Amino acid sequence: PRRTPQSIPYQDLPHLVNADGQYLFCRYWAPTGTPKALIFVSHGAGEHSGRYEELARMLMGLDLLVFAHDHVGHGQSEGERMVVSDFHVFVRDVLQHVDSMQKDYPGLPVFLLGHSMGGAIAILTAAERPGHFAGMVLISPLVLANPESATTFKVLAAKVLNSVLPNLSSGPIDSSVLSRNKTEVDIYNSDPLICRAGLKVCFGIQLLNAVSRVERALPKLTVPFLLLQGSADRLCDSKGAYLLMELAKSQDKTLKIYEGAYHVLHKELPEVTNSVFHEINMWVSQRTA
């Protein structure tokens, strides 16, 4: 029996096998009756699908069937931790899962919800299939890197390093910049399914590839979207949210800025989290009625 990295047999859990023969752990939240729509939840770097329990329960409460998987190299899925052969693997695997759900629920509209790197994955998925998705909810999507981290000098130095020692790691991401809510920082720091090892050079290069690919995809993006962004985000720069609003061709695009908020808006100070849940609820409800 194939087992998760935590030694649990996949036969005990919801799962799928991707095109590379890797098992991905899956999570579902289905309503009691006929769903109004489907929504895939796309998590960020280093985290996993279980972090979306409360948001998913809210969406299921709106009669959507919510589905997710842990991206390769994350959570309870297989793969070396936080590495990927090419960023497109994440997009391909989302499309596999979406195609499987659409075959089981034909005719239902499908939405995407993505945070952080998961938001870049959602943008690239929707840009790969224009007109396929009904809408997207983006929570601090990866559109622009922190400008102090991604200078030309440092990107060229990382490309040189990647050519020699692709597995060399930097220090870990500073978890205190994820959220002003210190209880949520403590929860993040003690979740065994989160990867807090330093970012490997090779994966840093894939995240730079995601940024480059997102920029080229923006003029192909026509899907309706809700974009939520904190003004003090040190991981996905707020300028990227403004760039997405300017360059996406979508006729239905809305931005809400949370002044002073950090990166994980759905796990921020209660005033911010409650607003994020309310805005997503309203936006999805208006587009599923």
Ligand SMILES: COc1cccc(C(=O)N2CCN3C[C@@H](c4ccc(Cl)cc4)CC[C@@H]3C2)c1Br
């Ligand atoms: C747990 O890891 C997490 C948690 C939360 C967010 C992220 C993430 O996606 N980022 C935070 C880093 N930044 C690094 C940046 C970069 C790479 C190489 C070089 Cl030379 C310079 C800059 C590319 C974009 C990513 C986005 C991660 Br990674």
